[PDB]
């Protein structure tokens with residue numbers, strides 16, 4: 265049994281009270297207050313549509329993924345990754361795809377900097393999308409479940425889906441459950457073929473074991489995974505530590 | 521040894537009487553009577569030239585392949601796939617290629633809806649046809665044999681041939697024998713490069729293990745192939761169910 269599996273079982277036994285305290289203990293998070301109010305008033309400039317803009321930025325600012333050229337954003341939801349990439353120098357085009365409808369976030373239209381190179385398309389199930397040519401492949405799909413075996417299956421499905429989109433391009437792909445042995449096996453194969461590394465984003469909540477397979481890095485997958493498991497297990501054992509609050513992204517205005 | 525190989529052996533040892541029962545047990549089939557008679561009288565409107573029009577329809581109405589723009593139809597034979605696509609809104613041109621001559625079906629001239637955008641060309645061996653730039657690649661080639669090794673080699677040949685035609689386009693390609701290990705290996709490589717999924721058409725007879733590699737899907741090829749093998753093996757025992765008969769396609773009349 266994996267360290268991650270022990271973590272999951274412990275997480276599943278928490279009360280909703282214990283869970284709510286745990287989920288943000290010692291994490292980093294952006295202050296969304298300003299953005300949430302502006303969006304409520306239908307402002308279309310400056311604000312990130314979600315916590316996702318800031319999350320992707322953390323990777324980009326550390327050169328783990330360097331968005332360039334034609335960017336595909338699989339599971340774009342409201343569009344946080346898409347809008348953020350649209351303001352980056354090397355990026356020429358952003359195409360976002362998301363399922364929408366009951367239970368799923370719909371793309372939010374914005375006029376943040378570089379909006380004119382973005383197209384977000386709802387009603388698109390990525391498992392039925394043919395792969396297109398692109399220079400950056402982003403994917404943020406993976407729905408949490410109390411069952412790790414369910415999560416294991418969802419994770420493998422994503423990994424099998426993304427592979428045809430990968431051809432010596434930049435990438436950043438969510439791995440919802442990286443600790444189950446079968447996933448590890450797949451990731452090892454994928455790293456051998458396409459390189460990259462798994463990385464834990466500090467803006468991730470303790471309530472999820474998600475890690476991101478980014479293109480620009482090397483290292484041991486198993487080691488990285490166990491380190492996160494250790495971290496998350498330890499964060500059970502301490503009274504809540506309030507999250508480190510950071511300024512949310514300003515995504516600006518106007519065409520490029 | 522694969523589940524498919526076991527099915528083949530069981531199939532080869534059936535009597536012609538047992539075969540004739542088995543081949544249609546529980547399948548779906550269109551009623552070709554009306555169409556067969558009209559075509560005998562030389563009528564050129566409404567009728568599909570083969571069972572193929574209905575067969576392709578099944579995929580298209582489920583978004584598995586979305587014919588659009590320039591459509592190439594490799595192994596068009598009488599022209600069932602070509603004439604069907606010719607009436608679809610997004611399709612602009614249909615070019616069908618088939619071998620013809622002794623033993624092989626010749627294109628049948630028709631005036632079904634959109635006939636004027638179809639060009640069906642006999643005396644064309646697809647294996648010597650330079651790859652052309654198309655938006656939809658269809659291919660329905662693959663001759664049965666009692667020997668799965670023979671079928672294996674025929675299948676690989678087709679898969680090698682189709683590959684250079686595929687470039688982020690829509691496609692639907694027959695895989696005559698998808699259960700032999702070497703074919704599975706090739707399909708796995710192709711799916712990694714080009715994506716798509718293998719699918720079983722219910723209008724297929726139990727007498728063939730053919731599956732179609734369609735562009736708009738993802739998933740595990742081995743798993744899907746074994747599911748068909750299981751379905752076909754079970755249909756040996758489960759006592760005969762007469763085929764579910766449906767109405768054949770009405771392909772209309774006139775230019776577009």
Ligand SMILES: Nc1ncnc2c1ncn2[C@@H]1O[C@H](CSCC[C@H](N)C(=O)O)[C@@H](O)[C@H]1O
Pocket residue numbers: 313314315316317338339340341342343344345346361362363364367368369388389390391404405406
């Ligand atoms: N099969 C599928 N195809 C397409 N989108 C899917 C999907 N399954 C889940 N999704 C979507 O994937 C999204 C992941 S959350 C999106 C966060 C985004 N990066 C941002 O910046 O805001 C959800 O909106 C969910 O609806």
Ligand SMILES: Nc1ncnc2c1ncn2[C@@H]1O[C@H](CSCC[C@H](N)C(=O)O)[C@@H](O)[C@H]1O
Pocket residue numbers: 570571572573593594595596597598599600601602617618619620623624625626644645646647660661662
């Ligand atoms: N190497 C080859 N080059 C061209 N056509 C070929 C071929 N091998 C087989 N064929 C043709 O492919 C056809 C397969 S039948 C599939 C045709 C489908 N029912 C339709 O109507 O569109 C046969 O008629 C056969 O003559």
Ligand SMILES: O=C(/C=C/c1ccc(O)c(O)c1)OCCc1ccccc1
Pocket residue numbers: 406407408409
């Ligand atoms: O069971 C689930 C799973 C869905 C899920 C989770 C995390 C994700 O990143 C994601 O893409 C999908 O729902 C989350 C539970 C929930 C819902 C509303 C309010 C509070 C809590």
Ligand SMILES: O=C(/C=C\c1ccc(O)c(O)c1)OCCc1ccccc1
Pocket residue numbers: 275276408409410469471472
């Ligand atoms: O709420 C969740 C947890 C995951 C998650 C992922 C990403 C997020 O950004 C987030 O806020 C949450 O998903 C539901 C699964 C679950 C619930 C309770 C216990 C165990 C498993």
